Amino acid sequence: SMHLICQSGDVLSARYEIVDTLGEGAFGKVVECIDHKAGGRHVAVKIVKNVDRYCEAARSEIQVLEHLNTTDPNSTFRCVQMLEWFEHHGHICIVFELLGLSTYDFIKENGFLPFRLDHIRKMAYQICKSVNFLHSNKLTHTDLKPENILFVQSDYTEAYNPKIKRDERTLINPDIKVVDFGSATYDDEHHSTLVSTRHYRAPEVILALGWSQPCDVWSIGCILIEYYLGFTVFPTHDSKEHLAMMERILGPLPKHMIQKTRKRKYFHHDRLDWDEHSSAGRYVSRACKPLKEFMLSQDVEHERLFDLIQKMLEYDPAKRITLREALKHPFFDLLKK
Numbered sequence: 001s002m003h004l005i006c007q008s009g010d011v012l013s014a015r016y017e018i019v020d021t022l023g024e025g026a027f028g029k030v031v032e033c034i035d036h037k038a039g040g041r042h043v044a045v046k047i048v049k050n051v052d053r054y055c056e057a058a059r060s061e062i063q064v065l066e067h068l069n070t071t072d073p074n075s076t077f078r079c080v081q082m083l084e085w086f087e088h089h090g091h092i093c094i095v096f097e098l099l100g101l102s103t104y105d106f107i108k109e110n111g112f113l114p115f116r117l118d119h120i121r122k123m124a125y126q127i128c129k130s131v132n133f134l135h136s137n138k139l140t141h142t143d144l145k146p147e148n149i150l151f152v153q154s155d156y157t158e159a160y161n162p163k164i165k166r167d168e169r170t171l172i173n174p175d176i177k178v179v180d181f182g183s184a185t186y187d188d189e190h191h192s193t194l195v196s197t198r199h200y201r202a203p204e205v206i207l208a209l210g211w212s213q214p215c216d217v218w219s220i221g222c223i224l225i226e227y228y229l230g231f232t233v234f235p236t237h238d239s240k241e242h243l244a245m246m247e248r249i250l251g252p253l254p255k256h257m258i259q260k261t262r263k264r265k266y267f268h269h270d271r272l273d274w275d276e277h278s279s280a281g282r283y284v285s286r287a288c289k290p291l292k293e294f295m296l297s298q299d300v301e302h303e304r305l306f307d308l309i310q311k312m313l314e315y316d317p318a319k320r321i322t323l324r325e326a327l328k329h330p331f332f333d334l335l336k337k
């Protein structure tokens with residue numbers, strides 16, 4: 001179905017001419033287009049699959065962005081600007097300001113190399129500021145990950161790095177925006193305990209204990225570690241394995257959370273029911289280690305990032321650092337000069 005209406009040269013809604021595909025996902029496609037009714041201005045158009053769950057999510061995203069873009073019309077808090085929406089051969093299409101690559105895509109195109117620490121500090125500060133603005137207006141995003149953080153401009157300079165015997169790209173401007181508001185949920189709406197595909201998922205979500213704003217803080221911690229290492233610390237698609245990986249990196253889960261969960265399959269007595277000496281178990285031991293052993297330097301700026309990450313990755317959501325507190329953390333002192 002979609003392949004028939006998203007090709008270079010096709011014209012959407014009698015005005016948007018498709019140039020090329022920027023990226024794909026489970027939801028559909030994002031394409032760059034020329035807007036022939038706004039003087040040729042280039043824009044990004046998200047074309048949503050004609051499938052009920054994604055159509056519903058798209059309708060929800062439209063409502064959320066209307067509210068956020070009117071509350072913050074100059075994008076002071078760095079939520080992407082929605083320009084319009086329309087329907088095209090049974091597909092919902094949402095038009096946005098054109099941004100650069102996602103942070104994930106940049107990492108991938110640079111050979112899975114990490115961002116350097118001064119860029120991480122700026123990006124982290126903007127992400128915390130943006131999502132805190134959501135938290136101040138009774139929203140939780142629920143789906144934060146590097147694919148959903150995008151550079152305003154993704155241009156780079158390029159040089160041979162003698163230390164690693166490989167060519168390396170350096171972002172010119174690290175400014176970002178947050179996208180994808182199709183899972184975003186208000187305090188006063190129903191919170192599905194069930195949630196779909198992701199490894200930025202908080203332990204209270206996996207154990208079905210209820211969730212709200214703190215689950216976003218957990219996700220942001222996972223993102224910051226990825227930016228620092230160039231790869232995910234939870235490379236898994238199985239819930240039980242994921243919990244085993246958490247235990248190895250952060251220590252054992254709090255007893256009171258193990259006691260409250262109705263997900264009894266994961267536990268024997270009050271311990272994670274995980275065979276350490278299986279095929280999968282030996283892989284977890286070999287790929288994961290305590291958090292601080294991932295540090296690449298002992299320099300104080302690195303220690304500061306790791307202290308903030310540790311507090312974001314607190315198991316109990318009632319004890320987890322909030323984003324208001326995280327914006328005052330010493331890791332960010334260097335930005336207030």
Ligand SMILES: CC(C)Oc1cccc(-c2coc3ccc(-c4cnn(C)c4)nc23)c1
Pocket residue numbers: 022023024025030044046080096097098099100101102105147148150179180
């Ligand atoms: C798969 C997707 C991230 O691929 C790219 C890859 C490169 C650029 C863009 C991109 C450029 O300007 C944009 C404005 C909005 C969005 C958007 C809105 N919702 N979602 C899920 C993305 N995406 C862009 C997207």
